[PDB]
Amino acid sequence: DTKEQRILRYVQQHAKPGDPQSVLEAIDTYCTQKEWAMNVGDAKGQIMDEVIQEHNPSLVLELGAYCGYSAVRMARLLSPGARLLTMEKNPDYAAITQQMLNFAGLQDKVTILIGASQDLIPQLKKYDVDTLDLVFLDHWKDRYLPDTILLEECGLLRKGTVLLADNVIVPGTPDFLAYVRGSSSFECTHYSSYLEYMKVVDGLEKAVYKGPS
Numbered sequence: 152d153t154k155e156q157r158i159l160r161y162v163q164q165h166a167k168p169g170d171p172q173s174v175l176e177a178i179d180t181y182c183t184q185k186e187w188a189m190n191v192g193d194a195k196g197q198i199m200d201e202v203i204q205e206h207n208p209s210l211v212l213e214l215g216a217y218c219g220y221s222a223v224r225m226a227r228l229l230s231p232g233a234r235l236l237t238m239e240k241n242p243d244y245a246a247i248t249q250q251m252l253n254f255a256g257l258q259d260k261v262t263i264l265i266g267a268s269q270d271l272i273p274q275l276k277k278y279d280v281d282t283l284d285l286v287f288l289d290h291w292k293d294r295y296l297p298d299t300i301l302l303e304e305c306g307l308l309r310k311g312t313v314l315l316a317d318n319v320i321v322p323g324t325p326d327f328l329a330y331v332r333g334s335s336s337f338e339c340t341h342y343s344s345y346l347e348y349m350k351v352v353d354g355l356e357k358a359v360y361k362g363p364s
């Protein structure tokens with residue numbers, strides 16, 4: 152029994168079925184009052200709402216679904232006929248996200264792609280996909296810059312495509328920022344958001360020297 156399962160089960164018994172707003176409130180409730188989890192959360196969600204509303208995407212690509220909070224957040228704002236693709240490499244997370252979408256009634260607007268972004272991005276041109284309107288980057292931070300470059304190399308960006316990148320300060324994505332900011336191919340805006348708490352996996356490496364080669 153995983154935390155992600157506990158989040159899903161809470162949603163299923165407290166949110167209104169078929170009601171995306173209700174689902175987001177249930178997750179945000181659970182994760183502020185019971186068990187913190189790595190969703191963008193409501194504060195950042197409101198920035199995301201405005202970006203979607205300002206830029207009016209018909210085709211959205213999300214990198215990193217987890218339990219589907221951000222996927223519900225964006226897909227509930229999309230017009231009929233619009234599509235959200237979300238790449239998730241963890242099959243168990245993909246399964247939770249599908250349940251979350253099904254409960255919220257968004258399964259028709261969203262397609263989960265199980266796999267790593269770096270492998271799936273070059274396959275997109277075989278999903279009836281020409282170019283993307285908006286990309287939400289919220290997966291492994293080491294991938295922001297290469298996936299962005301990959302997206303460009305695969306011809307998936309059009310003039311006006313919006314990249315929205317989370318966590319560019321904490322833990323931080325300095326390489327990505329210097330690239331898009333320094334590049335004449337990208338017009339960049341920054342949006343501050345206060346972050347009450349976050350936990351990430353880290354580690355130490357111990358390397359014992361055994362002598363030279």
Ligand SMILES: Nc1ncnc2c1ncn2[C@@H]1O[C@H](CSCC[C@H](N)C(=O)O)[C@@H](O)[C@H]1O
Nearest residue numbers: 190191215217220221240267268289290291
């Ligand atoms: N290369 C990659 N391709 C697809 N998913 C990846 C990935 N690297 C990490 N991930 C996934 O990215 C997720 C980051 S957490 C994503 C949270 C989500 N955007 C929300 O706010 O609700 C994790 O679920 C992890 O499994």
Ligand SMILES: [Ca+2]
Nearest residue numbers: 191289317318
């Ligand atoms: Ca994040």
